[PDB]
Amino acid sequence: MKICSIALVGKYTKLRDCYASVFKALEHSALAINHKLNLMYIDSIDLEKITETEDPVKFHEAWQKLCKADGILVPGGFGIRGTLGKLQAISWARTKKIPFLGVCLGMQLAVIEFARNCLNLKDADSTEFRPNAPVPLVIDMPEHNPGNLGGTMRLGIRRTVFKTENSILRKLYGDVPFIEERHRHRFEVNPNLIKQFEQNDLSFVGQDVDGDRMEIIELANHPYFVGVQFHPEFSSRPMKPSPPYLGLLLAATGNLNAYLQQGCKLS
């Protein structure tokens, strides 16, 4: 088979049990388009300047892996650790037009990266690990559901509704007006800052049922640059690969338009 190389920019330099569902979703997608998956694991701190100084061999190893990648994935995340590295990975994929998928934290970092470098909102940040942030672009937004005391994390299966008929993800999900996926997050794009994005290339193409939380992003003028707040891994299966992962492997291999034109068989 032809090989597809995908960089997973995360916490470790090898397969850990926290990425098992993620690996399985990529493999379903790979098999479904008759490619062998070569998943390169990159510890995101290695891509940072600090590592160039203290361990340049690791630094150049990380960047070589990132630069040979046909597709780049920033999955759901742990903490403040290696955030700058992930932003650099995202910057690379954006500017070099490499197929990109950001999941939960990876969507949020993608929003922040676009804000800093394409909207010139230089200090745009998440309040999660700096609550006194000047531009609070990503913020703590609990649900307040019936039968509970106080706010809670957005958890379990939820409906995401498409805001437009011109979304590549909508196509890949089989042209339905909404989807149901699993959530585990409390930080959201700040609604006070959404107006800033309207004349620019990053669009919010999916939202929760109430319309307060932006859940899917897509970058125009790029072959495939996608972020989702939910974890699409958890609904992937061999005969129905998770569309966002399928779209990444399709785009990484140069086969996306062909799949659209054959009628999205695997949706």
From Swiss-Prot:
Query: Which residues carry out catalysis?
Result: 104, 231, 233
**Where does the chain cross the membrane?**
none
This protein's source sits in the domain of life called: Eukaryota
Q: Where is the Glutamine amidotransferase type-1 domain?
A: 5-259
Role this protein plays: Catalyzes the ATP-dependent amination of UTP to CTP with either L-glutamine or ammonia as the source of nitrogen. Constitutes the rate-limiting enzyme in the synthesis of cytosine nucleotides.
What the record says about family reads: Belongs to the CTP synthase family.
Task: State what protein this is by name.
Answer: CTP synthase 2
What organism, scientifically named, is this protein from? Homo sapiens
> Which lineage ranks, top first, belong to the organism behind this chain?
Eukaryota, Metazoa, Chordata, Craniata, Vertebrata
